[PDB]
């Protein structure tokens, strides 16, 4: 009989005050949480944030919502949550978030005979994540998600992960175009402010970037042009037109790479690991052309010395460029 | 007993009139304010504004909400704020702001037995900031945030920082990848409009741009190419193909840097300090190509005069470029 169920629910909401937490003036109400990560949409270095979609469930017990005689879990309409008390949980490090509302508002209420309440939500949040791009594109990131109560201290509310380390699910199925999730952790602690001490729940991911792509697109073209500038050392110094044209075109080609990759690379201005490599290769092509000027100046009066300089330039330049790579990779890998 | 607490809260709001300010007709109500800054998301030179996320606490006293017999501070639900009087505080220079509302609206009401009301909000605002980009990228900005009462005058309401210089906390949390927080000040004053006078509170920061990025990407490539154009003076003047190709390719390379730099830097439609330097280098490479044309025109009939011009060019060109940098850097630093 659905008329009997209607009376039971209406009796619960009669005299129910939503301004008072359960066990007001008594022990703090324990709230358990768990998250199902639907997806991680985009990770942006420019804006220093990432987008997250998840199913956020909260668990708590309210003795004011205890019913008897109905051996069922009442899954009521989602509009009844506006007449109950719910925790004031907010995400401490989010820039913009919302609850999906198509076709109806994505919300769940599921009462239990003993007064327990299950409160589910579907949220798309854009949490902030500061990044250390010194080693870009060989960097490793650690983006977090902080969960905290807004108005109630530890004297009123408490947080814990429901199920221990198995609270968060779906992380293993997440695929990112540019990163790769390595590990995730769950942290529970208390945070002290001027007003008081607040419960805290933390979820963090460790992101490792994929370096294989950057080898072909970025590092390989710069290396080939640097090797191509060494061809001038194998041309006789009397061919002024050939060596100058080769020397200055590689410089022009090196600037084209720098001024066109920065458009593709994120526009966050400060020195990165890739910038030091491109500038390092820019010096070698610059010195290769500057070396010929020394030879072309003394080849008419000192042919023996000019030939000797070209012989040594065929060894010093390839050898020094190998030392530059060896120091670079060890310092960054 | 939760029933007793419900009676007290209902008694306070019974007959309460939200349309009348506290202590109506008497002394002005003092509203102490303190701000806890969360982060400064971004600073934009194109739109001349910065995005700020903060905790905005307001602290006044209303005798109508005084209660006795309850030795506790009533931390009520955030939905009770709609039934109380709150100041009409607004930010004068804000362009787009909102209160976070996931999972609930980030709002707080905490009453005290004497009638003191603590009212906190979590607000993300995009305040306008006039910028003087003449000295860009060596500039130093000063962005502000204006707090003012829209309706009431100085006789009705008063604003003051709660705690003096300790009112604003969390300045060290600001991590701008491009700027560096140098100083922040707190100002209290009065403002007169055509419709009356209003109290004013001001929070202002001072920002200094980081110059490390512009050295690698902008200044260094331009200096090396300008140096690379001096190689022409060390090549025998009968090698027309070598000196012309070197001279005209540096001009082409210099234009590539300038044209592909305005497409990456923020589009600031007036003259800055970075345009003067690039235009100065473009003149030097342009003059180095004119020098050879004069040499190429007179070397057949006056071999001595053409050779003399080449020797003096090896000294004058490097020397006058040093004066250009010495004047430029000292003026802008």
């Amino acid at each position: 009989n659905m008329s009997f169920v209607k009376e039971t629910v209406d009796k619960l909401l009669k005299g129910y005050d939503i301004r008072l937490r359960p066990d007001f003036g008594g022990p703090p109400v324990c709230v358990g949480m768990n998250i199902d990560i639907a997806s991680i949409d985009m990770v942006s270095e420019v804006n220093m944030d990432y987008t997250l979609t998840m199913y956020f469930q909260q668990y708590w017990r309210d003795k004011r919502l205890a019913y008897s005689g109905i051996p069922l879990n009442l899954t009521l309409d989602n509009r009844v949550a506006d007449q109950l008390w719910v925790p004031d949980t907010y995400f401490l490090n989010d820039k913009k978030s919302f609850v999906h509302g198509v076709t109806v508002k994505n919300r769940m209420i599921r009462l239990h005979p003993d007064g327990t309440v299950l409160y589910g939500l579907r949220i798309t949040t854009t949490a902030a994540c500061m990044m250390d791009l010194r080693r870009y594109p060989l960097d490793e990131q650690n983006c977090t998600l902080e969960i905290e109560s807004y108005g109630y201290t530890t004297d009123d509310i408490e947080f814990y992960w429901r199920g221990g380390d198995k609270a968060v699910t779906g992380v293993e199925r997440i695929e990112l175009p540019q990163f790769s999730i390595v590990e995730h952790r769950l942290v529970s602690r208390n945070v002290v402010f001027a007003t008081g001490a607040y419960p805290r729940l933390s979820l963090s991911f460790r992101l490792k970037r994929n370096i294989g792509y950057f080898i072909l697109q970025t590092y390989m073209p710069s290396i080939l042009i640097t090797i191509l500038s060494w061809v001038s050392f194998w041309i006789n110094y009397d061919a002024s037109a050939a060596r100058v044209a080769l020397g200055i075109t590689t410089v022009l080609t090196m600037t084209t790479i720098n001024t066109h990759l920065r458009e593709t690379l994120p526009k966050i201005p400060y020195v990165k690991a890739i910038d030091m490599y491109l500038m390092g290769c820019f010096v070698f092509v610059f010195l290769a052309l500057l070396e010929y000027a020394f030879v072309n100046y003394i080849f008419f009066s000192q042919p023996a010395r000019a030939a000797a300089i070209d012989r040594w330039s065929r060894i010093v330049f390839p050898f020094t460029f190998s030392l530059f790579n060896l120091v670079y990779w060890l310092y960054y890998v | 007993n939760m029933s007793f607490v419900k009676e007290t809260v209902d008694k306070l709001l019974k007959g309460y009139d939200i349309r009348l300010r506290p202590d109506f007709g008497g002394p002005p109500v003092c509203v102490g304010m303190n701000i806890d800054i969360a982060s400064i998301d971004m600073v934009s030179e194109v739109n001349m504004d910065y995005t700020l996320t903060m905790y905005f606490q307001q602290y006044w006293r209303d005798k109508r909400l005084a209660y006795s017999g309850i030795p506790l501070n009533l931390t009520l639900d955030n939905r009770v704020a709609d039934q109380l009087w709150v100041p009409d505080t607004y930010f004068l220079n804000d362009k787009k702001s909102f209160v976070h509302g996931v999972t609930v609206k980030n709002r707080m009401i905490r009453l005290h037995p004497d009638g003191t009301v603590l009212y906190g909000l979590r607000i993300t605002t995009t305040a306008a900031c006039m910028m003087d980009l003449r000295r860009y990228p060596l500039d130093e900005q000063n962005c502000t945030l204006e707090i003012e009462s829209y309706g009431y005058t100085t006789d009705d309401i008063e604003f003051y920082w709660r705690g003096g210089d300790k009112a604003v906390t969390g300045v060290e949390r600001i991590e701008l990848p491009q700027f560096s927080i140098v100083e922040h000040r707190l100002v209290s004053r009065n403002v007169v409009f055509a419709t009356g006078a209003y109290p004013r509170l001001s929070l202002s920061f001072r920002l200094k741009r980081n110059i490390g990025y512009f050295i690698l990407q902008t200044y260094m490539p331009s200096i090396l190419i300008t140096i690379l154009s001096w190689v022409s003076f060390w090549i025998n003047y009968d090698a027309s193909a070598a000196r012309v190709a070197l001279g005209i390719t540096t001009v082409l390379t210099m234009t590539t840097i300038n044209t592909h730099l305005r497409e990456t830097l923020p589009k600031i439609p007036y003259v800055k300090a970075i345009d003067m330097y690039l235009m100065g280098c473009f003149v030097f490479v342009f003059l180095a190509l004119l020098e050879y044309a004069f040499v190429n025109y007179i070397f057949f009939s006056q071999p001595a005069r053409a050779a003399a011009i080449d020797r003096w060019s090896r000294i004058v060109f490097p020397f006058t470029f040093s004066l250009f940098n010495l004047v430029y850097w000292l003026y802008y630093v």
Partner: nanobody
Amino acid sequence: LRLSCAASGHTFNYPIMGWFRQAPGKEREFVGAISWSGGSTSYADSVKDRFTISRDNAKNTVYLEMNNLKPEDTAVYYCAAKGRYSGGLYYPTNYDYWGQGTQVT
């Protein structure tokens, strides 16, 4: 008297360094804090204009320049690291990693 605090490891996840002193008869007291990158500093009221804090990222060191010392400043000085979203700055509980006790008289 110039105390220095040196850090290594994942120093980016803990961008704030703080100094605390523990009285023999009282509890830990806040002294000052320094951001690793920005350089902005905060000081306790009793030690304003007498102590100066600065840092360098060349070797990951935080400097505590002590001036106008007084006999009442006898306590064990600690160096601590605070997370990015650890909350308040004047409360020792929010700090995770605590350095070895150092005594200065």
